[PDB]
Design an enzyme around this catalytic site. Structure first.
Site, PDB file in Angstrom:
ATOM      1  CD  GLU B  98      -1.452  -2.595   1.154  1.00  0.00           C
ATOM      2  OE1 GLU B  98      -0.508  -2.909   1.938  1.00  0.00           O
ATOM      3  OE2 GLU B  98      -1.943  -3.467   0.394  1.00  0.00           O
ATOM      4  CG  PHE B 174      -3.386 -12.337  -1.967  1.00  0.00           C
ATOM      5  CD1 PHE B 174      -4.611 -12.980  -1.828  1.00  0.00           C
ATOM      6  CD2 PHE B 174      -3.276 -11.312  -2.891  1.00  0.00           C
ATOM      7  CE1 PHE B 174      -5.704 -12.612  -2.601  1.00  0.00           C
ATOM      8  CE2 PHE B 174      -4.366 -10.944  -3.667  1.00  0.00           C
ATOM      9  CZ  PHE B 174      -5.569 -11.582  -3.533  1.00  0.00           C
ATOM     10  CD  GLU B 179       2.280 -11.250  -0.398  1.00  0.00           C
ATOM     11  OE1 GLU B 179       2.359 -11.968   0.630  1.00  0.00           O
ATOM     12  OE2 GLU B 179       1.666 -10.158  -0.341  1.00  0.00           O
TER      13      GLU B 179
END
Lengths: 251, 251
Positions: B98, B174, B179
């Site tokens: 983010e 995720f 990742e």
């Protein structure tokens, strides 16, 4: 000092981002569109010498940009930017000026007017120590005055009680000059949080020195008053950034 | 679901705000202009049924938007968004997805393409649960893959160790899908921080359960591995929001 590049584009980008996506469940939206706000902002300083400002310069901009603020949640701060904002936590626990629309839009930016076209200086702004006080404080002083005038219920004030050169409360700080004098009868209590930085000598304490002076001023306005030093919620935040500090010893 | 209004205006505004003012000494600037990034982004999903997107839909947008990331500072998270972001501290302690340009621009936004003009809908979107997983994760999955692929040095992974219904490490999260499989040999170690929520029963522990499965996977990819539960700095952060919790008693 170096002015912010593409001031208009940054102002308008922040305005639109804020408008559609920021603080939606905490602060109301304002009536004016981003282009109307830019016009009010720009006219306050444009086409004038960089130091030709006073407390009324941005009057229209602030009138247009003012939001109603959440009762009991307004916070003021002096000399403790990171700590106050980390504690307020982007409006979740308290709101700061930098969470409101105008504070969000201009936070960290640098700009100044000039008489020659385009009316603002894109290369250099004065050391501001070169401008009289009413000019130097024109924008943020009016931001703080408008913010304080909209506060309701209990307000919180966070101060530095560990600075041997600057008292916790001073009549010429933005709080002393622009916020306290504009708290209305809608405010009921001023709650002071004195930060005692970890590992440093305690300079100011509640019930003494400048905090005693502040207490008298607050009471004179018929508001309630309370003061605490490194309340647990704050102390733990300080400890998170310096976990080996002596103040953070656990049982 | 109701999509974000004025998607292009919000994207462009966040992109310009980021460019001139965010993470200036933390992350590098991106070479493509904000208008070029919008064209890439809009070409990725417009004039397509949302259920037809896949991992490659946004691949060219991410190639244009990807920044080189500071060594040893990348953080991944699972089940602890708020705690991880508070601890990362807006890029100062760790970088999160983010904080990167694409992550900052699309954070919390909702959008959808459609086959009829103008190729997307700004009033209503079909609930995405009905779509296949590769379309549901098309954007943030590709974002996660590109971000993880850019990591170098030590990487940190903060996980929830107090959820009896959701293991701390899952192959289909995720982290397990996008990742961990994308960390290159420029990564040296995976440092796991297990968060044990205050007042809750401890569920997962380092060296056991899903955390041992993860330890094995990491070592199999020749990365070093370490794991800690509620290290002091993280404990204090949790304590700031629940100072009276039994785990927070100080001397």
């Amino acid at each position: 000092i170096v002015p912010t590049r593409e001031l208009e584009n940054v102002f308008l980008g922040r305005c639109k981002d804020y408008e559609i996506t920021r603080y939606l469940d905490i602060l109301p939206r304002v009536r004016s569109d981003c282009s109307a706000l830019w016009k009010d902002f720009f006219k306050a300083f444009s086409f004038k010498n960089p130091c030709d400002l006073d407390l009324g310069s941005y009057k229209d901009f602030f009138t247009s940009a003012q939001q109603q603020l959440p009762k009991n949640k307004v916070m003021f701060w002096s000399g403790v930017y990171d700590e106050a904002h980390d504690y307020a936590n982007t409006g979740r626990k308290y709101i700061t000026l930098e969470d409101t629309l105008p504070g969000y839009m201009l936070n960290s930016l640098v700009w100044c007017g000039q008489r020659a076209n385009p009316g603002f200086n894109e290369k250099v702004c004065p050391d501001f120590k070169t401008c009289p006080v009413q000019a130097r404080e024109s924008f943020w002083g009016m931001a703080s005055s408008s913010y304080a005038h909209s506060a309701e219920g209990e307000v919180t004030y966070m101060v530095d009680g560990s600075n041997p050169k600057v008292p916790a409360y001073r009549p010429d700080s933005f709080f002393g000059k622009y916020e306290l004098p504009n708290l209305t009868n809608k405010v009921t209590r001023v709650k002071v949080i004195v930060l005692h930085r970890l590992g440093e000598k305690i300079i100011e304490k509640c019930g003494a020195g400048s905090l005693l002076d502040l207490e008298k001023l607050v009471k004179a306005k018929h508001f309630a008053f309370d003061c605490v030093e490194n309340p647990r919620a704050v102390l733990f935040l300080l400890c998170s950034d310096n976990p080996n500090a002596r103040e953070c010893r656990l049982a």
